[PDB]
Amino acid sequence: MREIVHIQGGQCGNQIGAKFWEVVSDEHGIDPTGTYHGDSDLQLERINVYFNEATGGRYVPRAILMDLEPGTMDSVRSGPYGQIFRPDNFVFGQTGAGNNWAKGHYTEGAELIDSVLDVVRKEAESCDCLQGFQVCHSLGGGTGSGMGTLLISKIREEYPDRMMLTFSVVPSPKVSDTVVEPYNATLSVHQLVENADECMVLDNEALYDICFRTLKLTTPTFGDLNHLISAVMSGITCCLRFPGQLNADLRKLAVNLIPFPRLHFFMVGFTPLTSRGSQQYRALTVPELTQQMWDAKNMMCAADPRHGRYLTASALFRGRMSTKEVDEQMLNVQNKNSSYFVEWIPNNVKSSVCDIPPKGLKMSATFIGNSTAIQEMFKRVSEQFTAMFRRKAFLHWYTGEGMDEMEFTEAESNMNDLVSEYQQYQ
Amino acid sequence: MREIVHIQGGQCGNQIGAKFWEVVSDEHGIDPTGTYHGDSDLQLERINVYFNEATGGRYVPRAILMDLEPGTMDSVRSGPYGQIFRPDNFVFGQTGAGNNWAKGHYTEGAELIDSVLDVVRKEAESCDCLQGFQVCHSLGGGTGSGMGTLLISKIREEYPDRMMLTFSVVPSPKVSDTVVEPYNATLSVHQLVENADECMVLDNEALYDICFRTLKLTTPTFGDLNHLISAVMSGITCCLRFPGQLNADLRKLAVNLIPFPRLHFFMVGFTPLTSRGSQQYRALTVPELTQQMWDAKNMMCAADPRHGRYLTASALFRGRMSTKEVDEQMLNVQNKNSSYFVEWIPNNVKSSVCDIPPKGLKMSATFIGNSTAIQEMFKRVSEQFTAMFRRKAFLHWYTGEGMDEMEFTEAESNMNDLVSEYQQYQ
Amino acid sequence: NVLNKQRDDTTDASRLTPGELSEEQAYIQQLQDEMKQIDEELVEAEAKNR
Amino acid sequence: SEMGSTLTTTRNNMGGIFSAKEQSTAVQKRIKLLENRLEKAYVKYNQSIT
Amino acid sequence: VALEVDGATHIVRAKLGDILKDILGRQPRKHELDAWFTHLDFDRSGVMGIDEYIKGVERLLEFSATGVTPATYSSFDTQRTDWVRHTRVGYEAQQTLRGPMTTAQEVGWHTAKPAPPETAQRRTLGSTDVTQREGHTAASYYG
Amino acid sequence: REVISIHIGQAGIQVGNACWELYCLEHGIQPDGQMPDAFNTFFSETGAGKHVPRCIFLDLEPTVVDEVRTGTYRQLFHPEQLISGKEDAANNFARGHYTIGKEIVDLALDRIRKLADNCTGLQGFLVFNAVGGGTGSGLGSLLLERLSVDYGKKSKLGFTVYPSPQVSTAVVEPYNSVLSTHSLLEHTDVAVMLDNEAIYDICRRSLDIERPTYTNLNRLIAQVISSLTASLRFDGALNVDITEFQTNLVPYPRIHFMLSSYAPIISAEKAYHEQLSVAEITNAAFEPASMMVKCDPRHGKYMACCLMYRGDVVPKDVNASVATIKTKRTIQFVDWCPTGFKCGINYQPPTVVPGGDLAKVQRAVCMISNSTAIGEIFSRLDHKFDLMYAKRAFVHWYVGEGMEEGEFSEAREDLAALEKDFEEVGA
Ligand SMILES: Nc1nc2c(ncn2[C@@H]2O[C@H](COP(=O)(O)OP(=O)(O)OP(=O)(O)O)[C@@H](O)[C@H]2O)c(=O)[nH]1
Ligand SMILES: Nc1nc2c(ncn2[C@@H]2O[C@H](COP(=O)(O)OP(=O)(O)O)[C@@H](O)[C@H]2O)c(=O)[nH]1
């Protein structure tokens, strides 16, 4: 009934989405060959949200892969659960962007994006009642951030009534992979505040610290981080695919969390996240989930929430739980830490419960907090933007393509007034 | 009962007919040695439409091959389903025209056409009630176009009450085989506009494009192209051979497609045409078939249908289908593409259903649209003809044979007022 | 001989030069004008729908 | 020397060997994209009118 | 058992020198050790396989047994016409000489010997059906 | 479908000595004459286990003919078919057209008559000659004239060998060339120029044979002939007979002089290394570095082109390649035709000859076009004909044989008229 088209852009989007489709297919019991192998009939009535039946028990994901270099597409097709994607949905260039936002927004987009638009248009009309779109991409790269940015703009002006999620990793000074990270991030954020409905900020630094202490991994390869991100996304949309005692759809979360149409950047967390050596010594109850949920070292962004205030927050629970215990828990955590919440809004917490836990766990949760501390990350980026922009470093590889300097001045102006209004509402 | 004789002219006609009799014989379950070995009794009931009884379960096709060089005939006898034709029907000259329309219409015709007329007259008198004749040939070659053209004229003056189908390939400048393409195509069209009842315009250009885009093949030899055209010919003629919930014979389609006696040039399209890699990742629905039918990239002519308006269009469905879904799908197409249809004719769409799908599929459809876009192809050819005739190039190999200059001027005049009246009705 | 070689090369480089395609430019212009017409027609039809 | 100078000037003006074909294909690609956009606009408009 | 390979047919590849010394019984000289090392492999994997060792030893036996002269031309003109025809010298310098004469021979001197089987899998970006044909591309969109 | 081949002159039957060597290896026929229906167009099968070609070698001097009679192909050629005069024409058109032709041409024509009556489905004739010499030019024209009288409507493929501009071996070849054309105009239907200097360049550049003899030249000429008759001999995806050049390549009854070319001319070491496809050979067949006539078609504008394809080739990519040629701008076509090509595809790949310098190639191209550069060649020869005729040089030899100055003057103006025709049609 309610439908979600999934879009993966760039290298980060493809790898994360690949692991994401593994997690979802496992939850719905589809083997890597694309046939049904589950046991419960509860998985059967809600596969139209993510899959389309082709011919007698063959379910294909409703996804669109998009990049510019065949290396990523092959890494997709080589891995397990890599043969279930419809080969028509692999719209794909040949030359490569190369961390150039202008190349991802003016040069290569002009020949790739009409094609991706036709593919997504056919996939959107394959279903009847759209609920929204779900876009996974990065913010530093060129083929991911720039091209995904244009795709969001085109979609928002095509279907203006449907919701839109975007999960984007953001740069950090310590984990600073690309050198034009600020030049890409500022322009992408500048477009996301004018097009996207809401964005959920990720970063590799917080994921690293999480798998350091909580997971106690020794060699945390990228597969594990993408496994965490995938677990988060499934936790987001658990409510549409499963019945619960208090259903919270995508639009329901958005209208509960966005007080003002420019305040839609969330910080995310997940729980339980306990090491294999410590899963035996712990308890499984809602306070055990909650007091790990609100922990600042469990957030998936590099923004200490106790350096600012929460505007709103939301919890999505999965498993057989007691709603009384849920609400009294949210009540107590809001009364105890009263200063860290905003004053002019009562009941800063939206909560929901679903009746199906993920496989392997008895009870899980997902935390989506709209805090004001994100302005520190934006300042951290904008100052680097101004530092490079004072003496025009790396500027000509954007300038000599068609983009002018005014775009940068506009982007920095928007970032500055955006952190001003975060600070203002704090 | 109703009868269809087959006449194949020229090298292209012979090979096309070879694949045609292969696919029809397969549909009726008769082996390449000429004996019936099928299962269902439904196939036996309607084989007199295309066959004659010989001896002990041997059925010969009611086909007359005609050419001027034995290389065609050897290629027919070499391949499978080649030993089922009656050797008396291998009426066949000795010299060869050599891409000379005058050689195919005045010198060699004078001695071959009495013989081909004798054998077709014997084959027509042998059956009881003719429905029509069916001719497959080219418009670029000499021995095919010219000889078949005179044959059409002799047949129409003899039997003016029987229908007539002409599958004719038209040369395109991008796929340009011979040099005198316009000198032959203009003359043949000049005769077809007053002799043939209707024509199915083909070209190798759209076939190559279809194999590139939809089929995604590596080496599109002539076998697959002739396999496609044969599939179209089996689709257009399926209504007689198999009972359905709504039948539409040849005359039925002609009167539903031709509003004016000179407006009888059709373009065709066939579906489903999907790659083998994506063959299992899809479903088989009526909307899935309809979007592939009305796609401009699926027409088998090099004429963009969005550059004009359809005068009328017909769809022939095969397979157990829902007529309500068929009708509402045609209604949806006629509503959504409301500018591409002519205004002074409501309900421009004819449809029919047969209950037997072609072998190897679940459900199929053949599209026959009488649009106004064909005037682009005729202009595309006539401008070449005027470019050559302005300076009398290549003219003397025709004039020194018995043709005179006013024949070319007349063919120009007939091309010019035809494209004028197409432009008028647009 | 060398002068003839250089002259031929010069005429070849002269043949290779341009990219005008004026009739295609005109086709592009008429397509863009038709797109503008249909866009204003679209917004007018939306107003009529309201 | 005169032919050498003119040769160098024409080689500087032609901008490269693949330039003409790159330009022609770019024009063709623009034509295809514009035609597709125009068809989509017609579809949108006819949906509005129905 | 830690390498999880049947070891009965395996020597440690570091034992090649001592094996040569025990084979000769006297001592290895420089031109003997050179040939031994260039015909067997001593660089990539510590474990050895009997069949690899045999494959190398056969070539070594041939090399010791017979000699092809490096002078395949006695006429400068005929050699030169071969050079302009791009027909190449049939014999191989590794079979012909004991050591390399020049630095480029020294560059390519070790390519001949049979490679040891890769003890591990190899990660190679290989083109797939989606990349090769099914996947949508700009060229496909334009036809 | 049968076609017979006659060879005139010293160069003609040496070309035949390479052509029939190629045909026998193609159809698997040993030189003794017997195999250990595709052959039916060239060899008629007498009695039991014996095929004898449809050819007549003819010459005036018996030296090269009885070299054939004593060579390796003694049994293959019919003893009567080889025809030899008693004394040579000696580089003398008048001598080889009026003095000795009057003795030899009757025996030749009364022999080809019974060869044709042996034949059933005669496609046409194809003649082999060089116009620089005396025998090939003189009685070649005489033989062609009486053939046009006897049959007329049948096609005659003329593969002539014109003298090169700068590399040349005779002195009076301008007189013989001009006098041979004057009848080659209105007698031949389809005439193909083959020059030796361009073949020397090809063997030097591509085959990298720095010391080529006449054997190598005749070897790849036989490759060209075999490549344009392979459609008649074997069935292909898209075949083309001998009557199609007549229509598709001759826009005007007196403009028939076709450049030829071939690709890929590749040695044994350059094959196992180059990756061969259809696009590159379709390109390489159009450069002047691979034509069979030393002229610059960059100066000219093409009238028509014919593309023979042999081997592993599909119609798709040959269509794509010819599209790339049509869209390139380094070559230009005439406005008198927008459709300037005629493809042709045959399945069997070109065979290799033992000792031949070419390699086993998967696919090959034979291009036969028509342009205005040939109009430039004729003027180039016309210049050096005027130079020698202005001083009345060498004229006494021809007048002594029995001719006059009228035919010199009228052949000169006939070539001028033809020059007018090319510059007119090129406009
Ligand atoms: N391509 C090629 N040309 C040849 C060959 N042999 C002779 N020629 C050409 O023949 C021309 C002279 O005529 P010839 O064939 O030698 O002798 P001819 O044509 O019989 O005339 P006569 O000597 O008077 O009998 C020269 O210009 C040569 O270029 C050959 O084997 N290959
Ligand atoms: N979690 C995760 N992050 C990744 C992965 N690959 C790249 N990234 C992040 O993406 C950022 C650069 O994005 P990039 O790969 O260049 O995007 P693209 O090239 O445009 O597709 C780096 O800072 C990485 O931290 C991955 O597999 N997993």
Ligand SMILES: Nc1nc2c(ncn2[C@@H]2O[C@H](COP(=O)(O)OP(=O)(O)O)[C@@H](O)[C@H]2O)c(=O)[nH]1
């Ligand atoms: N689809 C298809 N077209 C062909 C085939 N053979 C030839 N043609 C087309 O036919 C045209 C030439 O027709 P031709 O064979 O010369 O006709 P004919 O000489 O009168 O018999 C060319 O433009 C080809 O594209 C074939 O096997 N399949």
Ligand SMILES: [Mg+2]
């Ligand atoms: Mg001679």
